[PDB]
Design a protein around this ligand. Structure first.
Ligand SMILES: C=C[C@@H]1C[C@]1(NC(=O)[C@@H]1C[C@@H](Oc2nc3cc(OC)ccc3nc2C(C)C)CN1C(=O)[C@@H](NC(=O)OC1CCCC1)C(C)(C)C)C(=O)NS(=O)(=O)C1(C)CC1
Ligand SMILES: [Zn+2]
Length: 200
């Protein structure tokens, strides 16, 4: 538009829930409903208590995941773009942005817990989805892994930004894209944690 005074501003990414991995059962929790998300996105002011490693996040138009590793909440650029995240004291600007890796990060919210980067060198992985499904994945390259049991793309949609973990619960990567044949996801593409650390 040419009329700057009426140009709009994109809202913040908002934490709307979490994937609870603290006990013996993985489950999704919602911490904010759609209306209060809308308001928090416009203000950038989110006073809700944050817990855990894997957050469910939303914009006005998309919902996906974000994962804390090394004190940074990481997600995908195709979900967040360059947006700020809502925080108790107002919007917080990304500290990392890499469109070429489809990667962004913000300082991790107070109250969150961070995963430890994996140093196991192990290829038996586990993908955690936004529905708290734990999907075994065999690592097949630097940034690829195969689903032991393929699933339709629908099952994975909304889970970008979620973690791949090793058997010890370390972070191996951040889920970025599905490798799809006729709508069935046989494999996943992920940002390796080493790539996160180089970005840092
Ligand atoms: C189903 C869940 C998957 C995790 C998920 N991701 C996607 O859907 C990503 C976003 C787009 O890909 C990208 N867009 C980018 C956009 C950018 O600036 C805008 C910058 C960099 C980008 N880089 C990528 C890829 C190349 C890395 C397309 N796509 C794919 O997975 C596609 N498969 C694919 O391309 O396979 C390629 C070949 C084999 C490997 C790579 C697919 C499956 C055919 C839809 C998901 O859940 N998203 S999401 O939460 O629903 C959401 C939409 C709410 C956020
Ligand atoms: Zn490990």
């Amino acid at each position: 538009g040419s009329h700057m005074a009426s140009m709009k501003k994109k809202g913040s990414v908002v934490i709307v829930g979490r994937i609870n991995l603290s006990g013996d059962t993985a489950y999704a929790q919602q911490t904010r409903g759609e209306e209060g998300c809308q308001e928090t996105s416009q203000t950038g002011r989110d006073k809700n208590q944050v817990e855990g490693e894997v957050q469910i996040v939303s914009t006005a138009t998309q919902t996906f995941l974000a994962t804390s590793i090394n004190g940074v909440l990481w997600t995908v650029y195709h979900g967040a773009g360059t947006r700020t995240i809502a925080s108790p004291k107002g919007p917080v600007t990304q500290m990392y942005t890499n469109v070429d890796k489809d990667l962004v990060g913000w300082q991790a919210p107070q109250g969150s817990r961070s995963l430890t980067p994996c140093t196991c060198g192990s290829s038996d992985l586990y993908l955690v989805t936004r529905h708290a499904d734990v999907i075994p994945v065999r690592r097949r390259g630097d940034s690829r892994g195969s689903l032991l049991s393929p699933r339709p793309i629908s099952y994975l949609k909304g889970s970008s930004g979620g973690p791949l973990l090793c058997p010890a619960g370390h972070a191996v990567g951040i889920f970025r894209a599905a490798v799809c044949t006729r709508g069935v996801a046989k494999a996943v593409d992920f940002i390796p944690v080493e790539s996160l650390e180089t970005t840092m």
